[PDB]
Design a protein around this ligand. Structure first.
Ligand SMILES: [Cu+2]
Ligand SMILES: [Cu+2]
Ligand SMILES: [Zn+2]
Ligand SMILES: [Zn+2]
Lengths: 149, 149
């Protein structure tokens, strides 16, 4: 098991459980996520927010692919897609994925979870930065991913 | 390299560098650390502060020893001893140690750094809890230890 306490504007505790396989299940309640709609949600390379969310670096990309959506083969391991907030800024996270293991050479422990101001276009927006960040825009919050009981 | 952004009352960014060996060097500037004098400083088992610093659990103890000081053989790997704050609450951390590696089966990545209200008696206080926590008292702040560039 692993766990992430979000720091920044958007608040919440995100748990990670080996499910497993194979797959890990990521969940938790998020609040303060404005405006309502879809927001990019990604594991980034470094678990360092000493300099703000900017210091977590680029998307976690161990298999050296382009940015995509969680269902594409051509996809960063850290590409969890979008989560959705309602009119009050509340969101429930409930995602299953098989490129974010809790051990092994490509584990996510000690990396960072990041949630974004905009929708992640899943690499299909035809923007300058579509194929790297999904054009997801500003980093609202981040948390270091930690070993949990 | 690894890094810790302190959350709680006491503020600061603590860096961890393989030095190395062998040994890792831990440093950074801390503020808000009252009252002046010695405060226990320890790596704890879980990088989880979802429930407050309490959720980081006991001292990191991979080699299954009793609590001691950093120079004892009979010592938790997480036992970094005491740091010192001046009259204004400021402290400079500068410690070298060889039981807190940044990789391997006994790495500290994804665990937690914790700083305490009291002096750690290094297992010599003859208190109920001397040989487990050093009688270090309340957890003022904690940070998850993260992978850094
Ligand atoms: Cu991101
Ligand atoms: Cu401690
Ligand atoms: Zn990506
Ligand atoms: Zn100890």
């Amino acid at each position: 098991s692993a766990i992430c306490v979000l720091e920044g504007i958007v608040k919440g505790t995100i748990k990670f459980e080996d499910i497993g396989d194979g797959k890990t299940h990521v969940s938790g309640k998020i609040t303060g996520l404005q405006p309502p709609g879809k927001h990019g949600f990604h594991i980034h390379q470094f678990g360092d927010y000493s300099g703000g969310c900017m210091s977590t670096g680029p998307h976690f990309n161990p298999f050296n692919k382009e940015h995509g959506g969680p269902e594409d083969e051509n996809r960063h391991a850290g590409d969890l897609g979008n989560i959705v907030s309602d009119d009050y800024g509340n969101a429930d996270v409930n995602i299953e994925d098989s490129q974010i293991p809790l051990d092994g050479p490509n584990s996510i422990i000690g990396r960072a979870l990041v949630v974004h101001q905009n929708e992640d276009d899943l690499g299909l927006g035809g923007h300058k930065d579509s194929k790297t960040t999904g054009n997801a825009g500003a980093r609202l919050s981040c948390g270091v991913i930690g070993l949990a009981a």
